[PDB]
Design a protein that fits this description.
The chain is of the alpha/beta class. The chain is 17% helix and 29% strand. The structure holds chloride ion (2 copies) and nickel (II) ion. The site of nickel (II) ion (NI) has 3 residues, from loops. Belongs to the C/M/P thioester hydrolase family.
């Protein structure tokens, strides 16, 4: 009676299989993991073995559980924390998560007898990818190099509000042949402890660090940002030299809460108003409307002058984003480019998808503490639809950077 995992990194699909069951036996499968602070994540699903007493998750549908239907990776993407408002993250990329898998007898709520167990390590630092902390000038970052002679096409990776240095996107990208820089800009070592001003000179220095590194191919670098990071990536593309291609995931394309400055140019903030928060029946807060109206549309003074960018731009949007109206913004950015005689950016819009489009099989966190506001907010997204968005967006990003870098 045995559990098989064929043929490995968190974002890679795997085939889960069970041999040695009774013919057409009713079983529950359960998956579990403790994250880096000891918080528990779990998921389960009910199945029936076939006539040979075999179960194959790529062919047999879940009849119920944390999800239902033909979902081979569901036991991983549907994982939910015990503790509410707790988000699935990876802070130490060099240590894997261990997933405990278990096959239990029956479909009963009170779990049946243990038929088998298996522990599989899921990785965030792919095979032979080398990691190095970067302290160069004021730049605080981490560099990931693929294995091989090199040099490699280079990408800089920028998160939104939250601060610190999260590496997990850059480490996984490094597994596809890109040198990648995870870049911190506040709330990390000696960097400022806040976000009162975005000064682009800091990010220019990170570009310069990358383009001068012996293992970074060039002539330009790729930029990948989410949220405020996406906006910073669009600003960098608009103002700096040697940016070859830019991907924005749920960016806004405007200076929002804080001015964007570079040398003798400043983009004024549009501002927000907290009276525009909406409290759901549940008590959750929805901030999607707090920002001031983008009057004039693409002519609005708060617009990042993205017509200045020399390279191509890809905009990725969660249609169910509750942090802000990423879909509306992406169109306006498109309208801005077209009006100054540039090519339409590529826009990919994902239905049922929220603000936080993570790498593949990262479980959705529907709501958590918003750090500025000190209240629990919804982020948007439905688990199944969000999960397919995260799988597809990864491939779109790889294809885009492959082509342009
Ligand atoms: Cl489902
Ligand atoms: Cl922000
Ligand atoms: Ni409600």
């Amino acid at each position: 009676a045995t559990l098989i995992l064929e043929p490995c990194c968190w974002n890679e699909p795997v085939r889960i299989a069970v041999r040695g069951l009774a013919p057409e036996q009713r079983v529950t499968l359960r998956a579990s993991l403790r994250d880096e602070k000891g918080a528990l994540f779990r998921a389960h699903a009910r199945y029936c073995a076939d006539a040979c007493g075999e179960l194959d998750l790529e062919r047999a549908p879940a009849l119920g559980g944390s999800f239902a239907g033909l979902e081979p990776m569901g036991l991983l993407w549907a994982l939910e924390p015990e503790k509410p408002f707790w988000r699935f993250l990876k802070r130490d990329v060099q240590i894997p998560f261990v997933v405990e898998l278990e096959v239990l007898d029956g479909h009963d709520p009170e779990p049946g007898r243990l038929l088998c167990q298996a522990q599989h390590e899921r990785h965030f630092l792919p095979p032979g990818v080398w990691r190095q902390s970067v302290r160069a000038g004021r730049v605080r970052a981490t560099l990931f190099l693929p294995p091989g002679p090199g040099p490699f096409p280079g990408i800089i990776d920028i998160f939104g509000i939250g601060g610190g240095l999260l590496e997990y996107r850059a480490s996984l990208l490094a597994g596809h042949g890109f040198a990648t820089l995870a870049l911190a800009y506040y709330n990390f070592e000696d960097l400022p402890n806040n976000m009162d001003n975005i000064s682009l000179e800091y990010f220019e220095e990170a570009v310069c660090y990358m383009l001068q590194h012996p293992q970074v191919k060039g002539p330009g670098i790729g930029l990948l940002g989410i949220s405020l990071g996406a906006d910073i990536c669009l600003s960098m593309a608009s103002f700096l030299k040697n940016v070859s291609a830019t991907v924005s995931i749920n960016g806004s394309g405007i200076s929002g809460n804080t001015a964007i400055n570079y040398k003798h140019s400043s983009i004024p903030p549009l501002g927000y108003d907290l009276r525009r928060i909406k409290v759901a029946f549940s008590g959750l807060v929805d901030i999607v409307d707090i920002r001031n109206a983008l009057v004039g549309g693409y002519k609005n003074p708060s617009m990042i002058p993205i017509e200045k960018a020399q390279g191509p731009i890809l905009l990725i949007v969660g249609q169910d984003d509750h942090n802000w109206r990423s879909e509306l913004y992406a169109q306006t950015v498109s309208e801005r480019l077209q009006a100054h005689g540039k090519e339409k950016p590529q826009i990919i819009c994902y239905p049922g998808t929220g603000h936080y489009i993570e790498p593949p099989y990262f479980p959705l966190c529907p709501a958590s503490l918003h750090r500025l506001l000190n209240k629990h907010v919804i982020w948007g997204g439905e688990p199944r639809a969000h999960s397919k968005a995260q799988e597809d967006a990864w491939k779109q990003i790889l294809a885009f950077f492959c082509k342009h870098l």
